Amino acid sequence: QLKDNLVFSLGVESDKIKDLSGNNTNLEVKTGVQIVDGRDSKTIRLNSNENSSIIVQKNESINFSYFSDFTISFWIRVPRLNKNDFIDLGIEYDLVNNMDNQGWKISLKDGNLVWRMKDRFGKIIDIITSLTFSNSFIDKYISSNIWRHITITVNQLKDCTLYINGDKIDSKSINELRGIDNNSPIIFKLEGNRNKNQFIRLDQFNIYQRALNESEVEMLFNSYFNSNILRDFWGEPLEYNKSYYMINQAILGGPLRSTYKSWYGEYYPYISRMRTFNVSSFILIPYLYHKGSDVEKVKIINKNNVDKYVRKNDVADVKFENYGNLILTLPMYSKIKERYMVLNEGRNGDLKLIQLQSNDKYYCQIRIFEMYRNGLLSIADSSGWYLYSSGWYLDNYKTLDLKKHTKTNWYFVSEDEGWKE
């Protein structure tokens, strides 16, 4: 029932950009704006050209007057920090702007997000997130090419609070601030960036006529993961029959490879040592695609699929595309009794893709069902790490330490324009 206070919601419906709130707010979408594939059907894409903007005239409901609390929320996907972005080092640039002499704006700066309010006396309050790639890449860093949910709550006279993925990040006292209302439109547009390769994907940009509390923001975030679909690394629905790189959470830059062990009759998949590149001397980025290497591409296959989407608890095979006809399985127990996985034409047991955490996680776990070697797919403990079915992790899942939890989480990654290497 957060819908009760929703006065504006920018998204795509039936091939068109609209206000989805029902309020029928008047938008001007210029011809440079695109509609692309998103985290939940289609999303807006803004490019670095003059025709790529959306202008929204404000009305009474969309009001930032001194006597009105409000919340702004949105899904954003910002390309992973790259060398082209360094031309904008230390320079804030606009994404969403309702600033004339006074007002508010949402900006990007040094891979981070800026919220700024300025009142009619020139009083300024901003939140500048201070995330670093090394420490926050996976869960919160903005310039990651991963879908992030942003919430900003404004209780005028009290505080301004910023959230990523339903978690409070920062807050400021705004008791000193007076009015930020103005008569200018809200402009959705990249403005001020010298890196003209920059582009942003933006979805469910919502304005609410109340300041949501911390519990309400968590609930809002959770409401975007109400289905049983699994997710890819970027936060988009996981699909069948789609080429992926498969990655273990414990070694993000470790490429999935395979090796024929002549002794046995078997090909063994393994995670190789972490590969990284430098964007600067101070920032190491993991390779995900490993172009110009023997990295194993995979597809998730299920002849009983109902649509293209992978759902929690589906039984499915992981097919190794390099080989054409081999799947991830265990070897015949009589031959090899150990829990190491091999690549075999012969299906030996069942794989189930599951989510033992919450629906919002962009990884999954993989449950092996086999007569003698039931377990969760993990990496064994180096040069590389073999895949194996862990009975111990399965039976003790709820109590596992962080490292073991990490080794049982799997990501699927597809190439995207917003992640270049």
Author numbering: 834 to 1214, 1221 to 1260
Sentences from the study reporting this entry:
We found a second toxin locus (ptox) flanked by insertion sequences and transposon elements. This locus encodes a protein, which we named paraclostridial mosquitocidal protein 1 (PMP1), with high similarity to CNTs, a group that includes the tetanus neurotoxin (TeNT) and botulinum neurotoxins (BoNTs). PMP1 presents the conserved SxWY motif in the binding domain (HC), which in BoNTs is involved in ganglioside receptor binding (Supplemenatry Fig. 1C), as well as the conserved disulfide bond that links the toxin heavy and light chains, and is essential for toxicity. PMP1 is thus the first CNT that targets invertebrates.
To analyze if the SxWY motif is involved in toxicity and to determine the presence of other cell recognition regions, recombinant PMP1 HC was crystallized (residues 825–1260) and its structure determined at 1.95 Å resolution. PMP1 HC includes two subdomains, a N-terminal lectin-like fold (HCN) consisting primarily of 15 β-strands arranged in a jelly-roll fold and a C-terminal β-trefoil fold mostly composed of seven pairs of β-strands linked by loops (HCC). One striking feature of PMP1 HCC is its general hydrophobicity, with an array of a dozen aromatic residues exposed on its surface and its lack of clear binding pockets. Of particular interest are the three extended loops found almost in parallel in the HCC subdomain. Extended loops 1094–1099 (loop 1), 1164–1172 (loop 2), and 1202–1208 (loop 3) present bulky hydrophobic side chains. A fourth loop composed of residues 1213–1222 (loop 4) was disordered, but seems to occupy a different position compared to the equivalent loops in BoNT/B and TeNT that are more protuberant. Instead, a similar motif, SWYG, located in loop 1 of the HC C terminus is critical, with an important role for the tryptophan in this loop. In addition, the mutant affecting a surface-exposed tyrosine hydrophobic patch (Y1100D/Y1101D/Y1173A/Y1227A) also nearly abolished toxicity.
